[PDB]
Amino acid sequence: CRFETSELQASVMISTPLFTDSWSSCNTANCNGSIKIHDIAGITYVAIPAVSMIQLGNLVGLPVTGDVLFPGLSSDEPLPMVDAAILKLFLQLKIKEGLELELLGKKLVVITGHSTGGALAAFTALWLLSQSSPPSFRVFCITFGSPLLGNQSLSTSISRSRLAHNFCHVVSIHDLVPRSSNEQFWPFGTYLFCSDKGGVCLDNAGSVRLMFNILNTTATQNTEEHQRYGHYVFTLSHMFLKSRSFLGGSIPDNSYQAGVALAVEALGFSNDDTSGVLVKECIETATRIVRAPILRSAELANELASVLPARLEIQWYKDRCDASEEQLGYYDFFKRYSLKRDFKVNMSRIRLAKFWDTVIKMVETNELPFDFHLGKKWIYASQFYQLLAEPLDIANFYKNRDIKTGGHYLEGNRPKRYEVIDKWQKGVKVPEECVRSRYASTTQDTCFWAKLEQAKEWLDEARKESSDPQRRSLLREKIVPFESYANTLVTKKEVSLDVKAKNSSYSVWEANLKEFKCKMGY
Amino acid sequence: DETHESRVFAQIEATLENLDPKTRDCFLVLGAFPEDKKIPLDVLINVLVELHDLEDATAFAVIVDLANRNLLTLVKDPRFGHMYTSYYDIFVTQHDVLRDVALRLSNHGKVNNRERLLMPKRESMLPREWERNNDEPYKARVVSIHTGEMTQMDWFDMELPKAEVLILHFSSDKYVLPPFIAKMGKLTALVIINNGMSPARLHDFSIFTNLAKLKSLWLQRVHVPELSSSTVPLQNLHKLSLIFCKINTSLDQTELDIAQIFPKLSDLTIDHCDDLLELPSTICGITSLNSISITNCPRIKELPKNLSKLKALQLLRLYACHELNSLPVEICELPRLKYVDISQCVSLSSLPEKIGKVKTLEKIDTRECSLSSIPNSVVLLTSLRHVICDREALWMWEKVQKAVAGLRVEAAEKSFSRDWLDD
Amino acid sequence: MAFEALTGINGDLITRSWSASKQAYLTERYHKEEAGAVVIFAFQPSFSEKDFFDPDNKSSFGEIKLNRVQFPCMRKIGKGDVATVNEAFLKNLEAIIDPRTSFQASVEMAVRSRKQIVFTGHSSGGATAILATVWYLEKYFIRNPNVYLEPRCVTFGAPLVGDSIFSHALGREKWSRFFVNFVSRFDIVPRIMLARKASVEETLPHVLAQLDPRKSSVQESEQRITEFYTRVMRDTSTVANQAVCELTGSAEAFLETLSSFLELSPYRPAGTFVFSTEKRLVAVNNSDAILQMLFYTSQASDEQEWSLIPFRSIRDHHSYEELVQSMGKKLFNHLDGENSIESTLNDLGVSTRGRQYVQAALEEEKKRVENQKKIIQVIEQERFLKKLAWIEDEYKPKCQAHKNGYYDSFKVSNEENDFKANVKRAELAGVFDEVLGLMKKCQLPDEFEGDIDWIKLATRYRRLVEPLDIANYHRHLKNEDTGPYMKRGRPTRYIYAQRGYEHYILKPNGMIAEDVFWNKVNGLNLGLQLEEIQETLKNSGSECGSCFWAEVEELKGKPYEEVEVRVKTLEGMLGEWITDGEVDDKEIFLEGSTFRKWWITLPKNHKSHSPLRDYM
């Protein structure tokens, strides 16, 4: 990385009218003592005032029963947790009812607050963005000198949801409130550290924690700095009229070094002091990634073309199975595993799995563009791959299964890449239902065979001479739904020719169920 | 009838008249195998070696020479008969007319005084001629039986003082070995092949207790017997192959000391075994082993950590172990290792860091392997002569190309061809 | 000297241009001046609010899209996006080029006499000169670059005119070298149109009155001037910060989230800009570096400087006579071609931070050039070309010797050759999609889409390999999953190749591909109105010769009464397709071809009068 961008990001943010408009709204809300809503030049500002006395420091879990729910956040363990007082205040002030009426018909909304009002504003924005259906308007959140809201699990959940770039926390380097919380509290979002000389943006939770530590150990405590944000905003917003040069010694010859030195100077620290070096290391550590994602994403097409022949081999194996005289369909051929071509197609399957696991890991680590999954090419390539390959993974699981202590594929044994690809499929415009004149070249439901395995187990258990008649009724209420779903799939021509092969497991199960119904008098 | 014979068989006999006795016998032996099926080279080679007392290279020469005369067809392969490669995964084919000529030649005269006892085709039970004349011993040195399922009452007694090789072909799920084996005083090689779609179970396996004089054994598509501590050791076995075999828990017994049974085994092959998950740790106790082949075993994930005991080991083939993830660090202590084959090992990523201790290494094959780097130690391998790798991995071998002179680094061309589907 | 060696103009021409610009104040809407071997057209400037913002335009910056028929080159070829310009300036030009004025006849007379033509102007006269130069290029220079000679455009303190696509298109056609723009360091008019209309609505008229060189009776109230300057510079800072952050790919996700909420000016510099001070003349070619410099050369360095700059910015719009008279004494530097730029930018009043951002702007162009060199190195390799050679020389003749053709073979066969062809199809798709991915992100130079070698290679690839992708689409029944190929299945790389080739072939004669296709359809005499035909031939495969098989797949199996018109259109285009080599005539009439097998089942009445009755 030859280019530092921490100062440029802060300059971009400070030069916009949202900066000043949101501060104006916050100041008015503080003066009034109540929530203020109004439009300025086509953007609605929701300012929330600062409540003088509330007890902070007690964390509690997010609601899961009440009327306020965050279905978009992770519910696994360890659990995300928030401050109890903020939730209590949000419930008390009945912000939900006010916003559900005042924001109707709006297009752009900025929620903002100062101090405890800032914490409440961030909580409100997170609630608005955490629903199952994305809001009909756009949302941004700006806070000024706000204390921390949650713990590490909440921060990680927000980051994994791709929501951390809707927040911007403006913090003065002499303000103690944002860095005076107990160690269980973690930051999230983008932080803008500002002084009398400029600002710097840090986006990494670890870097923000390190900066908090540095400021705690290398600063003097002035308790009246919580009332200087208007002065800071005025100074920063008017800085554009004068030219600002390096005031230290001589700038380093390297461009990256010069940028780092300028950023260190933007916060008031001399580059030859003891705290200047710590700040320099913090910034350099924050700004560390390699191999520009645009170029990486362009390159990936060659790697896909490298791995494509394995998919072609799976296609050829499917075609050869379709014409065989045994007439099992390629799922049962692979499951039997009694020929030499099965081992080779296994090779191809493993290669494909490795490639797509690497791609998903790269997406999750920000080595690719933030909008990589919205590309048509990659969506359709992943769809093609899954349609061909998932049945063979199901056959592998049910081949290598310990019959006694072996669970089921869909009951917690599905690979992660297939779930991520199913999620990606929700992009791209929906297709109009064409008229099908033939069976699909592949079964469009990629988990059909796992469901058939579960239905087969249910039918055998009901058939067993020890089957309990109550067990039998429950099992029939489990068995007839699958029969109806499979019949609908067959009549719509959504399955391939292999599902209809003479000696495939589906035909055998169908004949067995017909026999069972005939015997049982149903 | 007469015309077909006089017009084809006589011509082929005239052509065969130029063959010397060893090559003529190798030609005739080919009539013991079913029709239109491939014959792996290892079976034929071991038969010839134990019959005419040759070496492997000489018998390979015999087979190739037979091919040159248009009496035999080789099957195409990218590494057919290259240096240090195996013989159980390459094949030959014979045209129907040639097999008919061989069968007629071997089946001439009285049954008892024949050299070779062969069954031309699959039948339910043994031919009636053999039982009609069982009152007298047979002087044959080759017996080949091709039947279906057999039961203990389907067999009748037969005396074979001179038999040296026995070949059995069947296609079923249960089979009982003939009881006359225990009176085969000169049996040196045994071949048992199942053609069925599921593994077969062999009964009355105790005959192997008295097979003190066996030197080779070939098993295919069968349930490997559950070896126990009370088994009678095979004191003369030198070769052992298991092709498409089911192991179950036969080798998983903890109280099993495999080294006791095979005091002089030098060659071991395990191929196309899907339920093999690990090797028994006692295999390292066989000190006479010279070469090991564990190929097309997709679920094996690691090798035993006592490999440093196998001091006589020279060849180590592991290709197509799709899940093997590393090589044990003990490989660097082997003082005679010469050849390593790890091609099609798509889960293997790096080599042992001390691989530069094996100074006897001469050849390495890494075709379609997933290697991300090679250690800086390989610069110390002075004896290296041939390396095979992918076209994308040539940049990793520049250091060795510089250090070790006389080293040839070959990039293998990706192969099309639709023959793998013809199962 | 270096100035003439760089720009292609000399001091005498610049002096004459300034003189003609001065004379243009009196004449109505333009002035013509004849001098030996040179003819100069100078355009009158205007100083009203409605001459910068059109009162009937409802947008926030007064922009409008150009007409694709009048300016067919001002667009992005592969993407197909047209450029936008200022509406008031365009209306002024449209008024001037109206036949009732005699401007066009004068231009034609000047062309006939083989003189050197020059367009020039001061203030908005300069913007009119820029648009007139573009009009002349489109109407004369691209038709016959021998009969019609090169133009020159000279402006003095003009405002910005077009957006970034405008500049990109000028760069791709190699026309940027004709334009030269003179700017004084503190002049404000070049910066005005980077501001929102609502920011300067209240104060714009009074400042425009002050700027008029003829009006001298208006008060110069310092308050209004300072307010105007401050608001313009605030909007400029916003624009410059966002632009530099965008070009380096720094904060994509945050920038997108924030972009939803902002309104930023779309205007960008076009051509070569020459900055002048009392000691130096600096020339720059890079548009983004010029934007950064326009922001950073106007900042104050003390509290004493800040008390004189708002008035200086107005006083410096009337200082080009002195610049022309003193040109010969000053120093000359070319910024793009200098190893060290620190001293030059020091003398221009740029601080350390602005110097960082100008450096970044230049480095991005260097990166684009390196990317292009890497791409060329890749596509010149013999191993790459052997795949196309194999498809050309082995697969096609063999499938012809089978009497079914390589389209049908790829569609239905399982042999080794088909597997090899599939592998090579995927391998080539990888390379071309990598190039497309780099292009869509502006990581390549502006001139890549006009390079003849690239066009030839891409045309060869498309004509050879697109039929196999159509066969692949239909073999796997993908047309019953997401619809016809021509609507949603066609890859973008083939569309880019087709558009590049069409532009290259057709631009010399003025007309665009769509009108050519519609005229050719009208010429078939199907007996229908234009609207009915346009509705019947929507998303049809008869626009491109490499989509012949997609069209055949779509029309196959339907009754004739329903597809009469499409069958007739396809048969009409087939002969010209065969002549140009877009379709191979050794492939499609074979005995086992899909096209022949379908065509021989049509009614005999149609087959009697078909143009291709003797081929089959």
Ligand SMILES: Nc1ncnc2c1ncn2[C@@H]1O[C@H](COP(=O)(O)O)[C@@H](O)[C@H]1O[C@@H]1O[C@H](COP(=O)(O)O)[C@@H](O)[C@H]1O
């Ligand atoms: N329905 C469908 N299934 C799979 N792939 C599809 C489908 N429609 C289109 N595509 C392919 O998606 C990419 C999109 O690229 P751009 O974003 O437009 O640059 C393109 O390759 C489309 O191609 C056509 O689809 C086939 C895909 O085959 P492949 O997976 O073997 O590459 C191509 O043969 C082509 O006809």
